[PDB]
């Protein structure tokens, strides 16, 4: 097809093609297994592409869910996730919060299969509710005070990395983000402070009430990476980007009526990189707006957040 709608056969071809275009690995049978197990999730949700500037990095593909279901159980059913995985208890605890309000989405790598389980928690959730579930060890729960001291008091998403027993926890803070607050957040990673123009550019791309994704080791509580990102950046307003990201944004196909590109700056001890996502089918921008995400060039004031901070 050439139209906007998700089509599974075209998606198979586009995964192979896009992976070849950016020099990413491919696992043919494994990809077919993912597509068979999660076809309806991809069809009903927003399906989109992701990669990073690391040479040879995986082509990733994600569904953001409209169909609410136990995606982890499905993944286990399909042989895509170990039934004994030690991170299952945390994911079950987070999914069960608020009477089961959170909704699971899924991230996959063309060369490795299931990569991450995402949770959208259905609102501005107190950090305490997320970071003190009994499934988390004391060393992880102990980081709560560090987040609260930075004003990172509400969580909107968590992306659980099954390969690394880590979670990227997505906070929203009352901003604007300034040089010092960036420095305090970046310092959590333990990585070398960037030069001032790196920071100036990130700040230029933030909504007033900013997001940050913090990488948390779910055994030790160590933080070795933080990420700031900008949603639905128009191609003529892109920040400076690595040539691999520019290539990705040129070759990964988007069929959405409203194109949605995402740029993320990831800072961590193992090395910094740039992340990018690009819409494919099923209206990425719509689902993000419904989750109260803020887009580039729009008002990014969170009035609910500002009420919660006033109390």
Q: Spell out the SS3 assignment of the chain.
A: CCCCCCCHHHHHHHHHHHHHHHCCCCCHHHHHHHHHHHHHHHHHCEEEEEEECCCCCCCEEEEECCCCCCHHHHHHHCCCCCCCCCCHHHHHHHHHHHHHCCEEEEEEECCCEEEEEEEEEEEEEEHHHHHCCCCCCHHHHCCHHHHHHCCCCEEEEEEEECCCCEEEEEEECCCCCCHHHHHHHHHCCCCCCCCHHHHHHHHHCCCCCCEEEEEEECCCCCEEEEEEEEECCCHHHCCCCCHHHHHHHHHCCCCCCCCCEEEEEEEECCCCEEEEEEEEECCHHHHHHHCCCCCCCCCCCCHHHHHHHHC
Please report, for residues 5, 178, 180, the alpha-carbon distance to residue 196 in angstroms, rounded to integers and kept in the order given.
43, 12, 11
HSE on the CB side for 253, CA within 13 Å? 19
* Token pair for 258: 């409203």
* Alpha carbon distance 224, 84 (integer Å): 26
Structural determination approach: X-ray
- Are 110 and 64 spatial neighbours (Cβ–Cβ below 8 Å)? no
Q: Are strands 211-217 and 60-64 parallel, antiparallel or unpaired?
A: unpaired
The CA distance from 278 to 258, in Å, is 11
Cβ count near 295 (within 10 Å):
18
* Number of domains composing the chain: 1
* Cα–Cα–Cα angle for 145, 192, 212, rounded to 5 degrees: 45
Stated resolution in angstroms: 1.9
Instruction: Answer yes or no: is 156 a known binding residue.
Output: yes
Q: Containing domain of residue 28, as a range? A: 1-311
Dihedral of CA 168/170/175/176: which sign? positive
């Amino acid at each position: 097809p050439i139209d906007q709608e998700f089509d599974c056969e075209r998606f198979r071809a586009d995964i192979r093609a896009t992976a070849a275009a950016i020099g990413a690995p491919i696992a043919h049978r494994l990809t077919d297994t993912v597509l068979e197990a999660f076809r309806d999730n991809f069809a009903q949700g927003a399906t989109l592409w992701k990669t990073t500037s690391q040479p040879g990095d995986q082509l990733s593909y994600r569904f953001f869910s409209r169909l609410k279901m136990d995606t982890v159980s499905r993944a286990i059913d399909a042989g895509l996730l170990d039934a004994a995985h030690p991170t299952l208890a945390v994911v079950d605890a987070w999914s069960s919060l608020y009477g089961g309000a959170p909704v699971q989405s899924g991230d996959f790598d063309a060369g490795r299969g299931m990569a991450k389980t995402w949770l959208y928690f259905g609102g501005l959730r107190p950090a305490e509710d997320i970071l003190t579930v009994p499934a988390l060890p004391a060393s992880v729960q102990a980081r709560l005070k560090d987040f609260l001291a930075l004003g990172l008091a509400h969580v909107r998403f968590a992306a659980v990395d099954w390969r690394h027993h880590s979670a990227n926890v997505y906070f929203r803070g009352k901003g604007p983000l300034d040089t010092v607050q960036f420095a305090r957040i970046h310092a959590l990673s333990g990585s070398t402070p960037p030069a001032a123009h790196v920071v100036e550019e990130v700040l230029a791309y933030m909504p007033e009430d900013y997001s940050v994704a913090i990488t948390l080791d779910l055994h030790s509580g160590d933080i070795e990476r933080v990420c700031f990102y900008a949603l639905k950046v128009p191609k003529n307003a892109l920040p400076r980007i690595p040539t691999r990201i520019a290539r990705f944004l040129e070759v990964a196909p988007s069929h959405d009526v409203e194109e949605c590109n995402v740029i993320g700056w990831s800072f961590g001890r193992s090395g910094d990189y740039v992340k990018a996502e690009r819409s494919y089918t099923g209206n990425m921008a719509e689902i993000l707006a419904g989750w109260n995400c803020f887009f580039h060039g729009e008002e990014g004031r969170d009035h609910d957040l500002r009420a919660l901070h006033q109390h």
